[PDB]
Design a protein around this ligand. Sequence first.
Ligand code: AUT
Length: 327
Amino acid sequence: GPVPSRARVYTDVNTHRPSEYWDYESHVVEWGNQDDYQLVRKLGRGKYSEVFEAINITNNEKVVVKILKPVAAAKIKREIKILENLRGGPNIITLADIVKDPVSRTPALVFEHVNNTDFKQLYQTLTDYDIRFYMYEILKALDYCHSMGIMHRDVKPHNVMIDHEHRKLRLIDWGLAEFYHPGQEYNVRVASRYFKGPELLVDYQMYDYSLDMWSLGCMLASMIFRKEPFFHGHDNYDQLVRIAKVLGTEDLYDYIDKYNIELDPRFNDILGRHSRKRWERFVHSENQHLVSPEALDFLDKLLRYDHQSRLTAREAMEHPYFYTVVK
Ligand SMILES: CCc1ccccc1-c1c(Cl)cc(CN)cc1Cl
């Protein structure tokens, strides 16, 4: 069967802390007052919630209200416990309150409001300096949650709010987040397709915080190369083939061999044989201003098949790519 794996950092976080820290099922929710909030406009709806802009009438402040759709009671308590555990952490969205919505009869999570700058505007105009600056801010959020024994598992651009005017960033939507317990087998049906780590794509369940570092590398590659998304799979199988056309099939086979993973036989007809490509292949006159030897070296250290070989968030923060960032 598969060779077991454990993170190379923060393995003992959930053993050192008390059971009440990670046993989200035993957590008792402290309910706020729904009457303190007035919904202003619907901002969006995903598979698990409807999101609104609202006002806290007790202090007249703007808030964001996430009304959860009826789902397994386990997923709800998990998100709340993770949000409370991480509250106050650098660049972590602040959970301000939990109320029972009178209409849905489900919990409604109230967050601090972030004036999110238009995604297209950010993607099209952030500078090389700005990309390094915001990447450093995301790393502060990731190292903080990992150090707190939690993996986000849904790192993608739509989960990173940026108020560019105030140079403020928040990592949001902790609905797919989980506590990391060494030896635990997790569900591989996490993260959005283009951000899924090879571990998920080859159905290796004993993954860890390093999955977030792969997703972070996908975001960086898309930004600096002006290719959105970087690995553009038509499905979860074609997603692995798209990665293999860049990183090569020989390192893919070394990875699955290391962990005694057998690829799903449906890959026989679609994978093929691909050499590893040099990152300079993706450089051109329309993205050269965002590329540097430091950027390519950093990307190379995130986008590795072997989850145990990727930079951790804390190691990533001392990479030369961030030397130019004012600290
Ligand atoms: C393209 C992702 C990216 C890579 C590097 C620096 C910033 C970003 C980024 C992020 Cl994280 C969030 C948003 C807004 N949701 C926009 C952008 Cl441009």
